[PDB]
Amino acid sequence: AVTVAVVFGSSGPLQTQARTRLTSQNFLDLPLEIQPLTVGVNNTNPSSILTQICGLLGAARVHGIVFEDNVDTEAVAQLLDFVSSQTHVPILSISGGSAVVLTPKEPGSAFLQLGVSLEQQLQVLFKVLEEYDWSAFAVITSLHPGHALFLEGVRAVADASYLSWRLLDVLTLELGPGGPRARTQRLLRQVDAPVLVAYCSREEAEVLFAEAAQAGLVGPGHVWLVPNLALGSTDAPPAAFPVGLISVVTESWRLSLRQKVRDGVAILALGAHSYRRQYGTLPAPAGDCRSHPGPVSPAREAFYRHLLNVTWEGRDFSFSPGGYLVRPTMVVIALNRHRLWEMVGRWDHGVLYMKYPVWPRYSTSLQPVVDSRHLTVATLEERPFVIVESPDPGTGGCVPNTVPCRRQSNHTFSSGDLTPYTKLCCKGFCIDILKKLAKVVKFSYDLYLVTNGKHGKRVRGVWNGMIGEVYYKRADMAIGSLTINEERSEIIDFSVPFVETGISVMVSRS
Amino acid sequence: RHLTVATLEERPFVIVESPDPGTGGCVPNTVPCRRQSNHTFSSGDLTPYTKLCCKGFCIDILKKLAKVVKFSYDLYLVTNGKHGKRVRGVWNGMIGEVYYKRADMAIGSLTINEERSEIIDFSVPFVETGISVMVSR
Amino acid sequence: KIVNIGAVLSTRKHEQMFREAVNQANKRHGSWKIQLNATSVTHKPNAIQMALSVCEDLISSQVYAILVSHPPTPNDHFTPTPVSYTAGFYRIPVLGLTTRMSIYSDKSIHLSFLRTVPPYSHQSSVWFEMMRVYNWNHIILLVSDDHEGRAAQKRLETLLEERESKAEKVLQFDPGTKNVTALLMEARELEARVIILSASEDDAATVYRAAAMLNMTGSGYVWLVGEREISGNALRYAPDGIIGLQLINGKNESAHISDAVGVVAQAVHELLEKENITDPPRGCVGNTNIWKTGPLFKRVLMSSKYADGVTGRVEFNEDGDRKFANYSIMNLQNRKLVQVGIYNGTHVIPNDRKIIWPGGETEKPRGYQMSTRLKIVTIHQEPFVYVKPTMSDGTCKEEFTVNGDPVKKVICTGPNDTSPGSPRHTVPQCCYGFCIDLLIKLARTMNFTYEVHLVADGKFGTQERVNNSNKKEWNGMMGELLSGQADMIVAPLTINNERAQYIEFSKPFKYQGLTILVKKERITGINDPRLRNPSDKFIYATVKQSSVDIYFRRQVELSTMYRHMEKHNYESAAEAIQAVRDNKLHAFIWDSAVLEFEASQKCDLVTTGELFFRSGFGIGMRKDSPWKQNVSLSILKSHENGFMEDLDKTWVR
Ligand SMILES: *[C@@H]1O[C@H](CO)[C@@H](O[C@@H]2O[C@H](CO)[C@@H](O)[C@H](O)[C@H]2NC(C)=O)[C@H](O)[C@H]1NC(C)=O
Ligand SMILES: *[C@@H]1O[C@H](CO)[C@@H](O[C@@H]2O[C@H](CO)[C@@H](O)[C@H](O)[C@H]2NC(C)=O)[C@H](O)[C@H]1NC(C)=O
Ligand SMILES: *[C@@H]1O[C@H](CO)[C@@H](O[C@@H]2O[C@H](CO)[C@@H](O)[C@H](O)[C@H]2NC(C)=O)[C@H](O)[C@H]1NC(C)=O
Ligand SMILES: *[C@@H]1O[C@H](CO)[C@@H](O[C@@H]2O[C@H](CO)[C@@H](O)[C@H](O)[C@H]2NC(C)=O)[C@H](O)[C@H]1NC(C)=O
Ligand SMILES: *[C@@H]1O[C@H](CO)[C@@H](O[C@@H]2O[C@H](CO)[C@@H](O)[C@H](O)[C@H]2NC(C)=O)[C@H](O)[C@H]1NC(C)=O
């Protein structure tokens, strides 16, 4: 019946090829049983690729081709696109390496990459930034070919968003093996931004992270975000990658090669089945190199369209006209303390599912200690100085000039170790003072309210309130309506008073 | 990006001072300005131009414009006539300097009117004014 | 060490020319030991067989760079693609000599690709220069939907956005599709008289025939096209008087071969000093890694000033494209393609002959044809524009001033409709007042006729995010002026930065500010603590989609101001004044010119504080409208003689 071919190039064990056709007696779940064919190049060079595709085409009449590569191979995507354009055969790229989206396809192309574009990744990264309320970021791009598309995408996403996205500085570096050591440290030394979005290849990403570590740009107080270009073989990341690096991948990142091959075979089978049930006949197999078609046949243009909109096992695999995946279930992953890539959030349908209410920061990359510029600011509520409010319903988040403050835990029912918090928006005189202080001294802060006590009172030998939080190392500083007196100065150190107060008596003049 | 700005002294808006002898230069918040170099004051090789310092409303506006539009500029006063009047078909003053391309732009107490707006271009007014009558109480 | 270069040609004779040229290049240089060697291969019909031919011979030999030409018969981007892909797999630089497509400028697809000839997109640059020479501003971009048209449009838009300008409209013409008459019919309406075309031969011929059908080739129009539109089928049906251009050399293969081998040899000699040279992959089979020196070889090859070539100085830009060029400007004068100038690279140089424009005129035509019948929009503001119902015979009540002067009235079409909700019927009324008198004077002075109509939704207009989308779109008189339903706004429209980006404002015809109206005096400006601390005790509001809304929304210091305002905005100024007088709203923030007149006439109300946003009313027009200066001059004249004083005295007592 239907002939679907699987092409290789990941090398590794050689027995897997047999399994690739053993699964022939596994597709009984899929209607319209498919005859597979397994031939795998082991040098992944243009000559072998072209010759093996030529022989595979010449030997048996194939209806679709599935390609897979390991990692970090650039020009294979162009070769597969060229072969698809010439021979007019529907190819399907799975796994990685060749799954990086190649945006401008040839008019007759049928590459149909199983990847996600740059614009969607930037959309999800900006959604994450909105979730964690990081309005001011800086963009660091190399001279890798494609940075122009990245800049256009970030500008488009910034413009096409309700939030007032701030672009602090865009600086183009010059990475590469060895290269020009200088002119990067100087530029990275004067980028004043708490969150950085970087775009560079795997080796360039490693070099950039090493330079930033030498430049004091990693650790708490600095959050890095990268697309899949920086990630290579997520099974094992390099040591130069800083803990807390955030990226966005597709759902299939955790799947195995066999599962991806099954998914691609299922996609081709469902496309062929839809074509058969629409036209009442099996799809016409492709030809070979000789006698190039020229104008795309109407049957080809119909089989391609049928293959476009296909849904399998819940997840939808609709393909954009450009050849990539439109509206996929994307997962936002990050590098944990133990240097292992683990999922942090999902995307599903336009809605973020983050498992950290507050973004964590770790003692990693704190060799000079002073790099711990991050602070946690305990605070209370007093009507003139600090006032909280519910998030603005129109655009979520908060109103401009309103710092997001998380109430201490969820004491109403979670009065325990449970970390999840509850978000509110804080403003007032003391919040303005704290904002100006963070702008001048150049530090970052996590503002949070206090639930145990109000301002501090020695009860049974312990301290509660903001004084209690600061005295017990739970907060690096406390700001609000905190009065300076002798008992508090003996256990904690105050600052110069910024508003003079005292004890006063109020009466009724009526 | 280097604009040549012509101006003229008008007490509320433009004020010229000699630089402070003690520090060599002059007080900050005061843009250095030169006097027209037609008459050479070199006296040999010292300086062909009188170096003063200009301050006031119009100079503050010009500094704000330089910061916002991100351009650099010098500043020189006009010693050939007042703000500008057509005499024998030619223009003198600030309008003369701008119309004959001796300066990029003219700033100061310059009123927008039809006869000037025909020969040169004008920006949006930044302070309103007109003909007014002064009498002694 | 023998450094070998390679070439893929078609004629089987130009390869001998390439061998001769490389021999001469070897005869002249710093070192003579590198023994520069050359190899060549003829083109293959099958693209896959062509790529295999690249993998053999060229790649199999120890080659450092590859050159590729194009057969004379136009085949477009089909022949250099396989060699480009195969050599970009190993980052082996490939120099194109005759290909013109812009797909090879994209470094994401073709990684190691350089060219000695500018692509079709770069032609847009010279058009910009011509637009600077003849001061043309209103242009139409009739471009194909393929990659070439998109690239040319993107480059022209980038150049235009670097300056302060914008193309009037673009028209996407799907390649190979007949009936382009809809696009030409759309473009005929627009004010722009400069037509710019970017399409293939068949598409150019089709649009030329369609334009001849629509008489769009007559006097006043200007046509600027590219190389593809003055050759082949296009030239046969091209209208006379079009201005095209063509590259000087273009198809001189030998010049581009000598000029390429010279720069390649210079680059090799230049980077040989640093050494660390890595031998090439030596065959497609048996290697899977890129050639390490390759990227650095391309990087040093891109920056190579070979200023001794046949075709002049050779320099490459950031995308590996030949920086400069010389384009000869061609005019179709009586079925003959005559040259009238040469583009040096930054300015077009006219030396001989005279340009004959399509209409037969020997005089440079302006790039617009502003019509006489002018549609003018207006809003209902009491001191400026009184709108009154017309009697059943189609004219409204005659009236005279107290002094004894006749009140001039015009007919207008407003939203008067009995149906609820939106305006569902445009019943005419009669309009008069300050703005209408100014309009009558302006029309008399500038010699144009007008049709006055009222705004649809009763709002002045601020840009707002359109529903079920993420982009912001204008509304009110602003939206109607920008879209094209109205050609000029004669109404009390406040000048501000947000509107000035898209609309052109004349000189202010009325200076005023913003003030606060309350019932008949404990408010001082917008700085009183009550107005800085919003509460139910003191409620304040403005008119939705007005200048005050924009002013408060654009202020970071006054965010709470706008937050409180958003809960109580009003549909119109008159209903807001009525609500304030009836003790339903406490304070109303609005323009001083209207608020002071209301306080004087209707009494029982007081204006408090000093004006906190001084601005003016101005006539609004579309961006870069040709007759802005006229109007501005007239307005200034009206300020000088007596007209604005009379208009103030007669209307706003
Ligand atoms: C996926 O897309 C194809 C084509 O866009 C859809 O095929 C259409 O099916 C309807 C009825 O089922 C026909 O009336 C149309 O003519 C078909 N379009 C063609 C032939 O181009 C297909 O239905 C889509 N899948 C689903 C599940 O709806
Ligand atoms: C210098 O270039 C010539 C180009 O002809 C090379 O000669 C070719 O060499 C290859 C490989 O040995 C043969 O397959 C061709 O048949 C040869 N062509 C001819 C016309 O003889 C020569 O090998 C090069 N010199 C080197 C690489 O040292
Ligand atoms: C393209 O199609 C349109 C149909 O919308 C044609 O427009 C009609 O043309 C005829 C004759 O020219 C007129 O009598 C009709 O009034 C037109 N209709 C409209 C709605 O404009 C047009 O002629 C076609 N052009 C070509 C070249 O085929
Ligand atoms: C390409 O250009 C070169 C020079 O620009 C042309 O070479 C000329 O050839 C003619 C006869 O073929 C000689 O009389 C000239 O002296 C040559 N020029 C120079 C500077 O020596 C060459 O002919 C052109 N090729 C084509 C196909 O037009
Ligand atoms: C376009 O043509 C002009 C000729 O007018 C070229 O100018 C020549 O430039 C070279 C090197 O810069 C000089 O040696 C010649 O003397 C110039 N010619 C003249 C007549 O002065 C110019 O180089 C050409 N443009 C390009 C890109 O080659």
Ligand SMILES: *[C@@H]1O[C@H](CO)[C@@H](O[C@@H]2O[C@H](CO)[C@@H](O)[C@H](O)[C@H]2NC(C)=O)[C@H](O)[C@H]1NC(C)=O
């Ligand atoms: C104002 O415009 C009208 C119409 O454009 C001008 O009337 C034309 O005048 C010319 C000669 O002056 C005649 O040849 C036309 O036949 C007239 N057309 C119409 C429709 O009357 C009028 O002259 C203009 N006023 C001026 C120039 O002062």
Ligand SMILES: *[C@@H]1O[C@H](CO)[C@@H](O[C@@H]2O[C@H](CO)[C@@H](O)[C@H](O)[C@H]2NC(C)=O)[C@H](O)[C@H]1NC(C)=O
């Ligand atoms: C602005 O007004 C001036 C009048 O001073 C116009 O200049 C005249 O324009 C007409 C037609 O455009 C010409 O026939 C006259 O020769 C012009 N007069 C002079 C002295 O040059 C000018 O055209 C108006 N601006 C616009 C855009 O129409």
Ligand SMILES: *[C@@H]1O[C@H](CO)[C@@H](O)[C@H](O)[C@H]1NC(C)=O
């Ligand atoms: C690659 O080619 C075949 C795969 O069919 C394999 O048997 C051979 O050992 C491989 N050659 C290598 C790894 O050099």
Ligand SMILES: *[C@@H]1O[C@H](CO)[C@@H](O)[C@H](O)[C@H]1NC(C)=O
């Ligand atoms: C509050 O924290 C608890 C602790 O796990 C969590 O279960 C709950 O969902 C949180 N409520 C929120 C975030 O509204």
Ligand SMILES: *[C@@H]1O[C@H](CO)[C@@H](O)[C@H](O)[C@H]1NC(C)=O
């Ligand atoms: C330059 O100065 C001379 C006096 O030396 C005087 O005629 C006038 O101010 C200037 N002359 C010009 C501008 O021709």
Ligand SMILES: *[C@@H]1O[C@H](CO)[C@@H](O)[C@H](O)[C@H]1NC(C)=O
């Ligand atoms: C050349 O290569 C050597 C190692 O072989 C390296 O140490 C040196 O830095 C290189 N010089 C360059 C790339 O300029």
Ligand SMILES: *[C@@H]1O[C@H](CO)[C@@H](O)[C@H](O)[C@H]1NC(C)=O
């Ligand atoms: C305004 O509309 C109403 C309802 O349709 C109509 O009765 C009235 O005549 C209209 N006004 C004029 C001036 O025609």
Ligand SMILES: *[C@@H]1O[C@H](CO)[C@@H](O)[C@H](O)[C@H]1NC(C)=O
């Ligand atoms: C307007 O947008 C809302 C979403 O906020 C949507 O529910 C509604 O259907 C849209 N209306 C129209 C007419 O598109």
